[PDB]
Amino acid sequence: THSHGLFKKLGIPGPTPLPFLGNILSYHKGFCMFDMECHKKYGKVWGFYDGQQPVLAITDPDMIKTVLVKECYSVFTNRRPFGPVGFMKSAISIAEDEEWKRLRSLLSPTFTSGKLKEMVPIIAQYGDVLVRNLRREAETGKPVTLKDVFGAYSMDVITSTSFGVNIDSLNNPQDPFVENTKKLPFFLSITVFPFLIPILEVLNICVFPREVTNFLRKSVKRMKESRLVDFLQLMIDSQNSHKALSDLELVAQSIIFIFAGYETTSSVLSFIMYELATHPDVQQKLQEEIDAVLPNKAPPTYDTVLQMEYLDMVVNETLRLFPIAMRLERVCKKDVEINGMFIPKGVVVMIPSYALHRDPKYWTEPEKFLPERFSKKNKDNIDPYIYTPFGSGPRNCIGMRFALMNMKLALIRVLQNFSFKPCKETQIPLKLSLGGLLQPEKPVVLKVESR
Ligand code: HEM
Ligand SMILES: CC(C)(C)OC(=O)N[C@@H](CS[C@@H](Cc1ccccc1)C(=O)NCc1cccnc1)Cc1ccccc1
């Protein structure tokens, strides 16, 4: 202290920080609003302080490529630490430097296209469960809360695709697994007081509810020794030039994978159904393409999913409006200069995806939901370091091809059987949580009708 003079010295503009808090009072309207304002207020780069932590935002595409791709292993390897995490230190998304690079290698084959194609049948099964649970609510003309029914589905896929466990979480039952995965203001006090993280680490408070972790750690070791197609197997087969995945390291990835796909798959689906209900032509155009590819409600396959181009456009455009990461971040581990700009060690470098995804300077009518932006005609003009819903470079989203496949399979099955219409209780226009997550203020509730 006080690092509140850093950006002023480097000649980088940005809002004036208050003592101790830095700029965090400016988050009262959410991260996203704050990044847009800073983008409009200050232009291509700017700096601010999460408490005493300097954060440098960058928006130039070349400079974003340098940070995410060119200098990843060498400088910008790690995300901003948050804690306390206990043993979750060994999870790929949290691990650092050579330990991370190792975990990436051990888990990357698990997410190939070829392995993903063998998971499609298991992913296809619970699409049927989703429809039947939907129809029970469609035949009873009662508005439906999407996060529930989609979560029930996303939960169904996860437990099976990761552990082989096979539940209808929505109804079926208090089956022992649905629950420790139910625990699926603290993190702000972390920002003003990030000097307390190692305190909680010596106290062993895990941000991961210590009981969940205790359940799965033993739950995993039950599964391991009962077997001795899914992620757990794909990892068990891996630990059979890098030290094999240890037994606790394996448990921690599974947790990463359960969360990774739970609220993301679920919330993105709910974003898509929201837009599709408030844009009936896009819903119809989509159902037409689905029926042409899969006549007679033919079951989707890996190859027919990749065949649907407008399905791809609707997905991409929703992720434009609602990039659930909001920001991409990397810690500067060494004094460096990138694209003619000095960047001191210890600075956090931030890529404001949300702000970039809604920047009029790259997007005509950036608030409108317009899938044609992603037509094979137009998709070529889109700068991949502006549109970055899965990140970029060696630490991009390892689950990208799975998530897209998983969501597309869900949508196809549901649009083959139902049309979705706004209720009087639908929030139009949907508003984002002023909080710290990308979620609607109020949950998306719609009317479901059988075709
Ligand atoms: C719509 C769904 C998803 C979206 C939009 C998404 C987006 C993102 C983004 C933006 C990042 C940071 C990328 C970067 O820093 O360059 C990330 C990281 C990551 N995602 Fe996803 N994600 C999704 C689903 C999933 C799923 C289903 C998994 C399943 C296992 C997964 C596993 C991961 C992991 C492990 C990381 C960190 C990888 C690393 O640091 O080595 N994600 N995701
Ligand atoms: C304090 C706040 C909430 C701001 O930060 C966190 O704690 N969240 C990070 C910790 S990483 C790690 C954290 C996590 C595990 C379980 C529950 C909640 C968080 C993770 O892998 N989650 C998977 C994921 C989510 C989405 C896509 N792909 C993968 C999450 C993350 C990581 C990379 C990109 C975007 C988000």
Curated annotation (Swiss-Prot):
GO cellular component, one term: cytoplasm
Family to which the UniProt record says this protein belongs: Belongs to the cytochrome P450 family.
SUPFAM superfamilies in UniProt: Cytochrome P450
Result when mutating residue 144 to I: In allele CYP3A4*9
Annotated compartments: Endoplasmic reticulum membrane; Microsome membrane
PANTHER family in alphabetical order: CYTOCHROME P450 3A4 (PTHR24302:SF48), CYTOCHROME P450 FAMILY 3 (PTHR24302)
Consequence the record notes for mutating residue 185 to R: In allele CYP3A4*5
Illness association: Vitamin D-dependent rickets 3: An autosomal dominant disorder of vitamin D metabolism resulting in early-onset rickets, reduced serum levels of the vitamin D metabolites 25-hydroxyvitamin D and 1,25-dihydroxyvitamin D, and deficient responsiveness to parent and activated forms of vitamin D.
Quaternary structure, from the entry: Interacts with PGRMC1; the interaction requires PGRMC1 homodimerization.
Protein modification: Polyubiquitinated in the presence of AMFR and UBE2G1 and also STUB1/CHIP and UBE2D1 (in vitro).
Extra remark beyond the main annotation: Chimeric transcripts, characterized by CYP3A43 exon 1 joined at canonical splice sites to distinct sets of CYP3A4 exons, have been detected. All are possibly produced by trans-splicing. The chimeric transcripts exist in 3 different combinations: CYP3A43 exon 1 joined in frame to CYP3A4 exons 2-13, CYP3A43 exon 1 joined in frame to CYP3A4 exons 4-13 and CYP3A43 exon 1 joined in frame to CYP3A4 exon 7-13. The longest chimeric isoform (CYP3A43 exon 1 joined to CYP3A4 exons 2-13) exhibits 6-beta-hydroxylase activity, while a shorter isoform (CYP3A43 exon 1 joined to CYP3A4 exons 4-13) does not.
Cofactor entry: heme
Effect of substituting residue 163 to S: In allele CYP3A4*17; exhibits lower turnover numbers for testosterone and chlorpyrifos
Induction: By drugs, such as rifampicin.
Function in brief: A cytochrome P450 monooxygenase involved in the metabolism of sterols, steroid hormones, retinoids and fatty acids. Mechanistically, uses molecular oxygen inserting one oxygen atom into a substrate, and reducing the second into a water molecule, with two electrons provided by NADPH via cytochrome P450 reductase (NADPH--hemoprotein reductase). Catalyzes the hydroxylation of carbon-hydrogen bonds.
Transcription recorded as keyword: no
Primary site of residence: endoplasmic reticulum
Gene (name only): CYP3A4
Single GO term (MF): heme binding
Superkingdom assignment: Eukaryota
GO biological process: aflatoxin metabolic process; alkaloid catabolic process; androgen metabolic process; cholesterol metabolic process; estrogen metabolic process; lipid hydroxylation; lipid metabolic process; long-chain fatty acid biosynthetic process
Record annotation: effect of changing residue 422 to S: In allele CYP3A4*19
Protein name, per record: Cytochrome P450 3A4
